[PDB]
């Protein structure tokens, strides 16, 4: 359940809260890390906690909407939804 080094569910929330608001953040690989985690949690069917991460990343990318984070919102949402169309056949509507 590790995500950006954060092991616990409260840790990933607080750490990715910092990652988005305080960092110069690197190439889109770091966004695709959370996309990979969405795909893994899709295989493992732990989408309970992954929905938590999606809706909180919606919150944060909408609150920190500045160029790369605006683009990261569309990138993160779309990629989770296409893999969720592959497995479940429906798109997760956090909005």
């Amino acid at each position: 359940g590790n995500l950006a080094g954060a092991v616990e569910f409260n840790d990933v929330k607080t750490l990715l809260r910092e990652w988005i608001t305080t960092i110069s953040d690197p190439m889109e690989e770091d966004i695709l890390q959370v996309v990979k985690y969405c795909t893994d949690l899709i295989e493992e069917k732990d989408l309970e906690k992954l929905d938590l991460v999606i809706k909180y990343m919606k919150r944060l990318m909408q609150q920190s909407v500045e160029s790369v984070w605006n683009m990261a919102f569309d990138f993160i949402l779309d990629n989770v939804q296409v893999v969720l169309q592959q497995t479940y056949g429906s798109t997760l509507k956090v909005t």
């Binding site: 950006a4 080094g5 990715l16 110069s24 953040d25 690197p26 966004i31 890390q33």
Partner: peptide
């Protein structure tokens, strides 16, 4: 300094 590639998310996600 130049680490070649400088991640944050991925860095911690491999460093832990």
């Amino acid at each position: 300094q130049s680490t070649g590639t400088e991640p944050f998310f991925k860095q911690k996600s491999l460093l832990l």
